[model samples]
Target: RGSHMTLAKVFSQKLRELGISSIYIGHERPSLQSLAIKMLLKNYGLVEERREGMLITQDHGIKLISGKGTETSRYTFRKGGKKVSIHLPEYPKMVIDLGLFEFLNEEEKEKTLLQVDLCLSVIRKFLWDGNLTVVGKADYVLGRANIVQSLSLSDEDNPVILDPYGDVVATDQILRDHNVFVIGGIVDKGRRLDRATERLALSRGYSFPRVKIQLRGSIIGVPDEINKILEIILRVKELDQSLEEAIISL
Candidate 1:
């Protein structure tokens, strides 16, 4: 029989008889733990397949400042002054800082290039699907990654710095305001960008914002922060499931 007090009907149909467990209190709320887990799940793109389509089709690319092959000891042209110091302050610092690239060996250079390639392959198809480029001095010698090359970081759009140490903003609108998004491809969880490059970006009239994502307890070496931020972004840009709805949705 249907009843006006529906919750009673709901719990009463418990297969005729069942033992109920009393609500127990702990030092913390279960909701707090679940909130942490939800955030962690969101950071890793764990709740769903990595997203793509309208926001994904926007003209974007991963540009690792100095992530190209310029660091290889094999090519010492700039060091020898054969070319006009074709290096940025950011270049040597990144090469020297990351443990993966510190040795500057031909092997390390090639490996980081390939790892970036592997990283970008999925990133391109899923998120950008536009340009796959290596920003900085063009190195045709390291032909393994099949990247379009840029001799410098100058761009028509103010490049977005994906530094974890940078400012956190609503990047979906940022992307809409600018035609392109730039991400550092360093892939090292330990590195912090020097403020010099950021100043350089702003001097040229690019409102380059330093961006970051904070996940619980340092989930290091996960898909680059860009990937997770992109996951957060693809859902929010230009369309459905308003921010209010995300809060209200079950």
Candidate 2:
């Protein structure tokens, strides 16, 4: 663990004004919109079949570019000073989390934000699809699976235990199935989506999540009430103008 934490570099610069790139999946299979174009071929290492898809490049068999896909990704541990951690699916249980302990205070943060809002209000009809991963500085979907496994086999020093879905095996060369979520957002010092994605894992060593409540997610046809329009802009920060309605494709 060399320490590489990084939150949403301001929504990765607001997804580069809505262009977006950063990815390091490693498993969601060649479906990051088909690696934006696909490049690498026969022999892409990193264990889980090189985590399936890759695109990060500083100099690893160079190739991909016609559409680009390597701007961020830092899940490392190849030698001495080790450090690299990333993940934010809110948790292995997410269908909704819009209450985020509504300003936590006690009662176990309103019982873990009404138990993940009553378990996504009963699995929000089993949300069939969901996508909203935004990374910054690294972990941009394990592209090129760390160029055929490098991280010195996750023994950079210590912190063992890989299975409960935190992954770090090393040996069979694991370290690619990351879902290490731990969100945080206590804002008052400012705003702007609470300083955009809240203190993402303290500069890499990780740790700044304990929201104690409130959560949110989407999928299955999206728009699960779009957070009731994000609870109407968090109870009024704007958005009035007749609830602006209209265009929604299919």
Candidate 3:
């Protein structure tokens, strides 16, 4: 009776387009929240069956298993009942570091949510991997909403931070070298805190490498919005556009 598409429906459709046959929501058994998502996927026709265990394909003799209760959720494809170590198509990771959420006011918090939503929309438009992660206070801030995947910064290694005060400028080589890119979730309202993102990394002892994005080696008047930063990276990585071209197009 409903024709309107929910986020879950769109996400499922996207996954199907990306050649994903099945997905596991949580560890061992699905969590209460994850169960809801699974139900939605089933109802949306992305998954024909909803039962747990493994999905074995007779044609290829490959077994597909879900990464339930694992540190990082993954899809494992086994060939002829043996584990085949094959990497899937890679996509750059976009991380929104929400460590500065405590400092933002209520209005700023709402704005941050809106920005995150925009970021998700951007990812949905350009990526099939769904590699965006919101770290620090995501569950506490989002509260029962599975809008975006969340993880702790400690779970990731050698992340590249996009900071205006960074020592290096973001280049195609730098972007390709690192898989994880982080943008701070701070909303400056007339009172700009210089190097807030850099402070976040150091205060937490993250020691992540930071890079500044500029057009023609000029950082003057560069937009630092989360989605814009994300799009710039996507353009360079996905579309193979130069930094100047990416920023200028925006």
lDDT of each: 0.32, 0.24, 0.54
How does model 2 fare in lDDT? 0.24
Candidate 2 Cα errors over 4 Å, as ranges: 1-103, 115-117, 126-196, 201-250
Which pairs clash inside model 3?
Answer: 27-68, 27-69
Please give, for residues 1-250, the per-residue lDDT of candidate 1 as tens digits.
Answer: 1111111222223212332211111121222122122222223111211222111110111111112232211111111122111111111011111222333457545655565555443333222322334443344332222243332454353455555556563334554454334454343443444233444455776555655534432324334433343333333332223333322221
Query: Model 3 over residues 1-250: C-alpha lDDT tens digits?
Result: 0122122234434444566544433242222112223333223222333435443221121123343332221342222222212222233567777757778889877877788778866765455324666665535343222223334444534578787877888888898677778787554633223243455556777577768888777886566678887888877766667778789988
| Prediction 1 TM-score vs. true | 0.36
In lDDT terms, how accurate is model 1? Answer: 0.32
> What are the runs in model 1 whose C-alpha is more than 4 Å off?
1-111, 127-130, 141-156, 169-172, 175-177, 185-189, 192-207, 216-222, 225-250
Can you tell me which runs of candidate 3 are displaced by over 4 Å? 1-91, 140-156, 187-206
Provide the RMSD of all predictions against the true structure, rounded to 1 decimal: 23.8, 19.2, 12.6
Question: Model 2, range 154-173, lDDT digits (tens) per residue?
Answer: 22322222111222212211
Clashes counted in candidate 3 amount to 2
The true-structure Cα RMSD of candidate 2 reads 19.2
Error of 3 at 233 (Å): 0.5
For all predicted structures, in order, the TM-scores are: 0.36, 0.19, 0.54
